[PDB]
Amino acid sequence: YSLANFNVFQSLPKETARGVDDLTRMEMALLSGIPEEIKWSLKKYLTYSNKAPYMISLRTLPDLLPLFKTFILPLERIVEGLNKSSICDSKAMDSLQMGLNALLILRNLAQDTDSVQILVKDREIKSFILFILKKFQCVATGDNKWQLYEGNATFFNELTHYTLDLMEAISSYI
Amino acid sequence: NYEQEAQKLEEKALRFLAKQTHPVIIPSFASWFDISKIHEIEKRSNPDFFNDSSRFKTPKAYKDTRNFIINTYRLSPYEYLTITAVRRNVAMDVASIVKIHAFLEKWGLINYQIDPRTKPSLIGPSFTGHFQVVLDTPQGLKPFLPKEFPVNLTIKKNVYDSAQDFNALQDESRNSRQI
Amino acid sequence: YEQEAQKLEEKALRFLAKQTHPVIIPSFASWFDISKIHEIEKRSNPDFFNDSSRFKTPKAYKDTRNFIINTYRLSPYEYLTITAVRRNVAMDVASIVKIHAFLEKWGLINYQIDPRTKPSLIGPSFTGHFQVVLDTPQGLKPFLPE
Amino acid sequence: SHQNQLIPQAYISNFHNRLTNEDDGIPIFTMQDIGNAVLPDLQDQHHNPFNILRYPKIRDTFINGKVVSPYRLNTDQETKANANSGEAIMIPITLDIEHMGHTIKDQFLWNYNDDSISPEEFASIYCKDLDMTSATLQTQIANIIKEQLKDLENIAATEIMSDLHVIINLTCNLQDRFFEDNFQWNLNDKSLTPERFATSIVQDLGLTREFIPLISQSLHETILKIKKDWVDGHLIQDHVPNDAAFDIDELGSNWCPRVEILTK
Amino acid sequence: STNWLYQHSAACSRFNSDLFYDRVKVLLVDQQGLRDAYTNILHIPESTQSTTVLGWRRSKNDSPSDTSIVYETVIHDNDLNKPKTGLSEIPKEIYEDVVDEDVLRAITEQQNFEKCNEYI
């Protein structure tokens, strides 16, 4: 009826019967570059940061922050290019949404001591926070250099909020 | 004339074609992989074969080794394909063999351990059509000709009703009135 | 005195030619002269003219090239392998392989041969046409392109 | 088509039993219908894996097999600004070890310039494959590897700058087959590597793939030896016996390779 | 004494034929392939096997709702008469500037032919 009915196949562990632990699956999916896997893994990482942040703490899992930085710096480039209609394509929208999701994940993790301690010791994240804050200041003081195009305001809105939260946390370490 | 040539060519190509018996399962994140091409993920994870540093490490050698390992695994996907067997068959330095084996094993391309009798089967968006995987013609089987001569033969065909039939590798021929 | 040796070698090569089969040189190799070099060889195969060693000299290079071409033309319906040439030629194996691959590239050695006579390694078969099955986080899904 | 009909994947391993058997001659660790076919790789089973059991070897793999936990290497944590990208230090390594009632004769290459893997890890992998895990065996293997590394280390890293041509006799025995060949090798041209040479020889003679490492490896050996005799000045360069017609570099030059099965 | 080169060359050709016949006898005639024991797997000369995969092809069924899959392999041999050589590898900076116009056109044709045969 089936070759699985051998005695040899009576001693299989329960750990591999599914194929891969979900943490490894999410890490490898982020490592791939396939957009569908990227979106799936980012949704799962966001849920974990919201409902179980101790399983993905930036200390117990090193080399987790580099991936988020890879998703976050193109967000800096986009935000600089956000003073005009520039989200015409769907790949641009996908990159923007991936950046926003990674930023929210970072903020949710920064709500913890070890994760924010790891975040402070990173020049890239602090420089990005400063860049977003200077853009917000340019919007606030009403400078003629960089004027937000209202068709994008929504995006910017969310962005600002996350940044400020991050700042709040790291405000204790400067 | 050419009709008999193409007929004998199809006969020979079908005689020396690897008939698949067991299904191969790989995790979804390993979907960028092609047996005949090299991806950026492979060049980043193995910079020594492509940075032109050594002469013993060439992209051709890497590709031949990894294709040997892939074919050996795919031909019998129930066993484990230990490193020692590969090392006895391949002629590289042991460090490179180990690195390639570990890289292929991390991405589930080989030695991906599941128990596929505990998961459902779905249908992707791409479905319900004729799929023709076009592979190059083998040499040493081309005819001996002592005008053009194009060839677009078809070697073997398989039909499936559902995706579960595709996964289980069950064709309509035997499935129709099995018991 | 040496002119007499050249005469002997010329007569020997003429006999070789007089007992060789007729072959069909491809068009893109028509620049080839059996008694010349043509400076395509000089560029593609350096180090036979840099006076690098006492061994690799243009005269010996030309001799080996002509010998290999005639040994092939003795029976054009068979792939000429490197082991035989290596058996009947005095030169470093590297240079023999260089000349063999060069003459092969321009279709001067194995252009029209019985393809069953070409040697190839024995690896496992080719599992490229096989059917793969992805393991999504939900269930097994048939891998198929779009 | 039922879920239950599928087979698990990548659990069994019959390798050790293939090592132990005498019908399967492994030179290491010793003490429709089917015609003259052994494996089903080219004969199509009619979409029924059960027929796979018609062949005794597949049955042996499915009956005398063990369940194996996978290797878990160090996940290839490469380095920080290391691997200075030297060409290669390719030194051969042999193993003659007498375990209790067991022999182990093996060979391989080792890149001394690559610090990615350590001899202890290789010993662990080897002993797991042979299914003979014992700390004493692994310590012996690692010590042998370290000794052979320290011996031929400095000699291998000596690039020759003057044209040398040497007549070389390669002789390699797998278990009972002896491969002997003679040729003329230049120790200055980095174009041809012994691996390509071995591949060409195996292609032309139609031998098994197992000869590709062996030959090449042995070739490496001889090269190193010659280097010693060229460092100690004990290597002459005045002549080299190649049967050349009358000047040098002519058309007789040597004999050819052969493979012979012997006894006694 | 003008028969030495010819005898050596004929011996070379006979050696070549002997090697070919021995390979064919061992690998393909007596048994179809050699079963290696390290991996427990058949080994057939790579020539009999195909090398790469030239993309895919897709179409539709005859009727809608006919949810079936037709998986099938296909070999493609654009211009089986003309053999392939390594001519797609020689850089332009070698054969140029010393060639006849016709030979240059032939070189370009061969290179383009190989490059296009690498396609579907």
Residue numbers in the entry:
A (entry chain N): 60 to 233
B (entry chain I): 57 to 202, 222 to 254
C (entry chain L): 58 to 203
D (entry chain Q): 2 to 32, 145 to 359, 368 to 385
E (entry chain E): 316 to 435
Copy text verbatim from the article accompanying this structure deposition.
SWI/SNF chromatin remodelers reposition nucleosomes by translocating DNA around the histone octamer, and in vitro assays have shown that they move nucleosomes to the ends of linear DNA fragments before evicting the histones from the DNA. Seven of the proteins (Arp7, Arp9, Rsc6, Rsc8, Sfh1, Sth1 and Rsc9) are conserved in all eukaryotic SWI/SNF chromatin remodeling complexes, with Sth1 containing the ATPase domain that is responsible for the remodeling activity. We found that RSC is composed of five main lobes, three that form a relatively rigid core (head, body and arm) and two that are flexibly attached (leg and tail).
The core of the complex was resolved to 3 Å, which allowed us the de novo building of this entire region. An asymmetric Rsc8 dimer defines the backbone for the complex, scaffolding the three core lobes and contacting all core proteins except Rsc3 and Rsc30. Rsc8 has four conserved domains, which are, from N to C terminus: SWIRM, ZZ, SANT, and coiled coil (CC). The SWIRM domains are in the arm, the ZZ and SANT domains in the head and the CC domains in the body. The body lobe of RSC contains a helical bundle backbone, an α-solenoid belly and a β-sandwich hook. The helical bundle is made up of the two CC domains of Rsc8, along with the CC domains of Rsc6 and Htl1. Four proteins contribute to most of the arm lobe, which is made of the two SWIRM domains of Rsc8 held together by the Scaffold domain of Npl6 and the RPT1 and RPT2 domains of Sfh1. Six RSC subunits contribute majorly to the head lobe of RSC, which is made of the ZZ and SANT domains of the two copies of Rsc8, the BrD and Scaffold II domain of Rsc58, the Scaffold I and part of Scaffold II domain of Sth1, the β-barrel domain of Rsc4 and the anchor domain of Rsc1/2.
